[PDB]
Amino acid sequence: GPMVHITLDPDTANPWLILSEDRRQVRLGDTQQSIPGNEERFDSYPMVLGAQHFHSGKHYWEVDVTGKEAWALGVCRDSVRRKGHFLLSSKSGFWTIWLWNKQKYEAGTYPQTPLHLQVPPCQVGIFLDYEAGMVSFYNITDHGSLIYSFSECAFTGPLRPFFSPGFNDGGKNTAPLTLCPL
Ligand SMILES: C[C@H](O)c1ccc2c(c1)N(CCCN(C)C)c1ccccc1S2
Predict the structure, then answer these.
(1) Which residues line ligand 1 (CB under 6 A)?
(2) 114 lies in a domain?
(3) Is the residue at 49 inside a domain?
(4) Which residue numbers delimit the B30.2/SPRY domain?
(5) Domain count, the chain
(6) How far is the CA of 55 from the centre of ligand 1 (A)?
(7) Tell me, what CATH number does 142's domain have?
(8) Is 23 part of any domain?
(9) Which structural domain, as residue segments, surrounds residue 37?
(10) 1 C-alpha to center of ligand 1: Å?
(11) Alpha carbon of 120 to ligand 1 centroid (Å)
(12) What is the residue with the minimal CA distance to atom 23 of ligand 1?
């Protein structure tokens, strides 16, 4: 089946992130960790990838976002640049949605698409269909209604799960992203 046990890849995690020992949770830290500057690590934003690689097929997982004022979720090319600043955008190899400012939900098209969610999600489901070129996001709190779907994605290599528990803002958004047991 499509359900997949996601774990986080510590080698990609920006130093502002704290990963749980089981690598199923991630949160913003109050200070930067001292860790290596290996090529895989995102150096400019608090992001981290799942360890799993997708080359084909259908895949699904869920993330708890309860009570966070900001976060970003989805999938990206393994080949996306890790160093420096960039746009979280389908044009750049990212298929993501995000919340910021407590109630601004957007999809990472470029230009960005504003999202209008009648029921703020406490848990989000991400569905990847490699062959169909689709990444879809579901509001678990709202009985699995569709938040947004990217279609006509032109996948060419391995894809990775993508996660950010927020950006650095002074330590208000400390709660973790948690991968849900499926
Ligand atoms: C600008 C570029 O696309 C970019 C790079 C890195 C991040 C974000 C955007 N945001 C989205 C902000 C969209 N509007 C507001 C510009 C974000 C949102 C939620 C959690 C982490 C992040 S980190």
Answers:
(1) 45, 70-72, 87-89, 98, 100, 164, 166-167
(2) yes
(3) yes
(4) 4-182
(5) 1
(6) 26
(7) 2.60.120.920
(8) yes
(9) 10-179
(10) 32
(11) 19
(12) 167
